[PDB]
Amino acid sequence: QQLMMILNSASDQPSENLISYFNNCTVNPKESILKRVKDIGYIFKEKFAKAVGQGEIGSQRYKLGVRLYYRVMESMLKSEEERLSIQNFSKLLNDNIFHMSLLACALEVVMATYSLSFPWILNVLNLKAFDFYKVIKSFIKAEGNLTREMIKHLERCEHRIMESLAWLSDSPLFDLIKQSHTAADMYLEPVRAKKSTSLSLFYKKVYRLAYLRLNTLCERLLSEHPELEHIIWTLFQHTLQNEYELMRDRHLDQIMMCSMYGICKVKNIDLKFKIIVTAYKDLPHAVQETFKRVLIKEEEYDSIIVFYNSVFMQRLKTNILQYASTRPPTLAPIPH
């Protein structure tokens, strides 16, 4: 509630300290920024009314959004003025996806407080989840007044992007995989190259999530062969790096769960999917759809026991059976 007061008493235009940054740029960004907020005003209010009906509020959410947007931009530019060359500084301040993502993230903060759920704001602004993802941590860090509940919200957004939304079709994540540290660093990367800080950072975090989640399920279910934890992870991680195509329009936890059943299967352990899914409903955000509605092929859906048999084994029979021979694949690092 303390940030909400700073916003309502604040202005709808950029600060004087903020505009100086705009003037220190080689290409003054101010008119393209301002036009961008105005141009976005229309589409926001439109789609906002297309869901909440006939109110005036759409206009009000957005103007608080804009108020946060400029506040944070100014906070963020304060660190980046020492970090970035003059030409990088200006490139940032004229970069459209940077602004789309900063504003989209301000707006999600207002929306969520006054609760149209995430990922609503991405569909409204036609912003890819993987581009939006890049702004979240730097946004949090630059707005010291976010409440706990709000921080937790942006992180649930971030985790859902890592777990699902970044892996949708047409997402730039797959483009970047084919080829192979602040938000400004990631937005300044050219679309055409070198190694991508965006991709490496994303995977680094995905692994920590996946392993953390996988770890939770293993301490509950797999203690009579506790060695299995590290084994399952090696398959899980090997699959995320080199068989990444299976995450297309899928969920990290679907891949997680198959790696569990497969590894205990090939070590001749009898422990069915039934115990896995029931125990998984107990994860902090688990929805049973994660395993009741799983995609197989060509837009046809079935339960997870079907995905494991028809899609997962097709690809990994070579890989999984490796784990039972006399020279099994070497163990993957546990993410820090």
Numbering used by the authors: 383 to 437, 440 to 499, 512 to 576, 600 to 612, 642 to 784
Quote the study on this structure:
The retinoblastoma tumor suppressor (Rb) is a multifunctional protein that primarily regulates the cell cycle but also has roles in cellular differentiation, DNA damage response, and apoptosis. Essential functions of Rb occur through its pocket domain, which is necessary for regulating binding interactions with E2F transcription factors and transcription repressors that bind via an LxCxE motif. The pocket domain is the most highly conserved region of the multidomain protein, as well as the most frequent site of mutations. Protein X-ray crystallography of four missense variants reveals how mutations destabilize the protein fold and inhibit E2FTD or LxCxE binding.
At 25 °C, the majority of variants that strongly reduce E2F1TD binding (by 10-fold or greater) are located at the E2FTD-binding cleft; these include S534R (820-fold), K530I (63-fold); E533K (59-fold); E544K (34-fold); R656Q (13-fold); H555Y (12-fold); and K548N (10-fold). Within the cyclin fold of subdomain A, the greatest destabilizing effects (ΔTm) are caused by E554K (−7.0 ± 0.5 °C), E533K (−6.4 ± 0.5 °C), E492Q (−5.4 ± 0.8 °C), A490V (−5.1 ± 0.6 °C), K462E (−5.0 ± 0.5 °C), E539D (−4.9 ± 0.5 °C), A490T (−4.7 ± 1.0 °C), and A488V (−4.1 ± 0.6 °C). For E554K and E533K, we sought to understand the structural basis for large reductions in RbP-E2F1TD binding as well as substantial decreases in thermostability. Remarkably, the crystal structure of E533K shows something similar in which the mutated lysine sidechain creates a salt bridge triad with E554 and E551 in a manner that occludes the Y411(E2F1TD)-binding pocket. Together, the variant structures of E533K and E554K reveal a structural basis for the disruption of E2FTD binding. However, from these structures alone, it is not clear how the mutations induce fold destabilization. In the structures of RbP-E2F2TD RbP-E2F1TD, both E554 and E533 form A/B subdomain-spanning salt bridges to K653. It is possible that the loss of the salt bridge interactions contributes to the large destabilization effects observed for these variants.
